Structure formats: C-alpha cells, structure tokens
Design a protein around this ligand. Structure first.
Ligand SMILES: [Cl-]
Lengths: 145, 140
DNA sequence: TCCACGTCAG
DNA sequence: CTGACGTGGA
C-alpha cells in the first residue's frame, strides 16, 4: 500500500462506496477512518472524514481531524496507538496523507495534506480525545463547497 | 425491484462484493440472505453463513434466517417471503458464495419448507428449492 | 479474535 | 432505530 498520489485517482474524483477506495488503493480499511503502514514506526497514509466524529472542515486549507476510539459502548480515553499513533508520527515524517471527504456520489478525494500538529482535549465527560491539524499541501487543484 | 431474470446478468456471472448484487439489482440487502417484496421472495444468497445444503445437483436446502443459527426462528419477513413463494410459484434468483466471491446460479422455485427441532430445542426452517430446468450449467 | 468515519431495507 | 449469510486489517 502506497504513500502520496495514486495513479488514476485525481483530486475531485468521486465514489459511492468505501469499498472502492480500497479497490483503487486510496484507502484500505472498510470502516475505519485511518489507514497507515510500517516505515518500523507507523506512518499515516489516508483518512476519511465523513461525519462520524466532530471533525472541522472550514472550506479552507486546514482541517481538524478527531482521533478514533474512546467512544466519541461506554466513554473511555482515546489511545495513542494504531491509527492515532500513525497520524502523530506523520507529523515528524512530514509525509503526505490522502484525505477523502464524505459528501451529502458519497465520497470525494480531496488531495494531499500534512499533519502539522496534534493535541489533547479533556472532553465533556472527562476522557481524552485527540485532534490532528492537517494542512493541505499548497498548489493542488481546488474543490467547491 | 424486479422478479425473474435480470437484464445484463447471466447465469455463471461472478462478483466480488454483495454491494454489486445490489447495484445491478440482483439482490438488494447488503448482508441479509433473503430479499423479497410486497410477501414473495425474489433472491437468496447462500454463502456459508448457515448450514445450507448444496448437492452440486438441481436441488438446494436453504436454512431460514434468524434464531441465532438461541431462539426459535420466525415465519416472518424473509422466511415468510420464501414460504408464500411456494404457492406463488414465482422464480427466485439464487446466488452462491464461492471459495471472485459470488456467482449467480440462476432461477429456482420453492417447492416446500418444513421445521426442524434443533440440537438445543428451538426452531429452524428449511426451504427446498429446485432449479428451473433448462438453464445453462454451472460447474463445480 | 476483534474492531471499525459500513450500508441496506424493513 | 436496528437487525442482517458484510469486509478488511491489525
Ligand atoms: Cl463496492
């Protein structure tokens, strides 16, 4: 499974099903929001933001992406591991990450981003949540919204 | 959603995903084994999930859904569909899961059904479908 | 073995 | 709202 741009897939491309991001090699997991891979430190390779968490899409070049897990079953911390750990190490690896957005014909490839930072958030209950600040790599084609 | 043969879909056709039987209108549910409509049955998927019987012949025994196969099973929704399809003598598409994941096996009728007191004490239905004679052959 | 920003239709 | 012969990858 490959980093960066994917042959055949262009910014603004749309898809109906998660299972096509997998087929085309854009995003492997069938449900999970984060896909990553061993480098042996985990690095992130793509994320889907499609309404499942409290993600922030400004219609700008910055997005806040919520970490997975913790029930955001009963309310638990979130954990810096698997996907979450991937995204973080991708802060330092400065590697590009595909970002796919779910739309109100269901998904759109939004292009490449980097993970500038992450932080923690004591939530409305008392448990952790991570937030990863991704910036879109400047100079890619644009999309409407 | 249509009964009988589907335009564009031929016996022996294969597919990788449940979500293509839906796209092509072969079988709507994404997981469920039985699809029906206002109740008569219109298609079933037998892909290893229950103790179905595939003789490599023209008859198949299809297990009813539910009951955790621990509760009885119930003659309702899909199960009820299949049964009323006994009397409606309407054709039913039958898709088989294979060990690139699914294969349209053609048309069948539901000749009968019965009940089976299982290894625990609760119900299970079994529907005997016979393949409509005179369609191309699937090898196995 | 188990979880996950599934996905459909009653 | 939730049950249903789901998928893929850790
Ligand atoms: Cl698909």
């Amino acid at each position: 499974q490959i980093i960066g741009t994917v042959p055949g897939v262009e910014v603004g491309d749309e898809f109906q099903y998660r299972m096509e991001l997998n087929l085309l090699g854009i995003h492997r997991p069938s449900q999970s929001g984060i896909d990553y891979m061993k480098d042996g430190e985990l690095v992130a390779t793509s994320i889907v933001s499609s309404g499942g968490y409290n993600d922030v899409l400004d219609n700008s070049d910055v997005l806040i992406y919520t970490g997975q897990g913790g029930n955001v079953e009963p309310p638990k911390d979130q954990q810096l591991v698997t996907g979450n750990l991937a995204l973080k190490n991708s802060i330092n690896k400065k590697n590009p990450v595909r970002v796919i957005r779910g739309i109100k014909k269901n998904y759109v490839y939004d292009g490449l981003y980097l993970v500038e930072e992450y932080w923690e958030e004591t939530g409305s209950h008392g448990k952790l949540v991570f937030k990863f600040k991704l910036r879109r790599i400047p100079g890619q084609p644009e999309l409407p919204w």
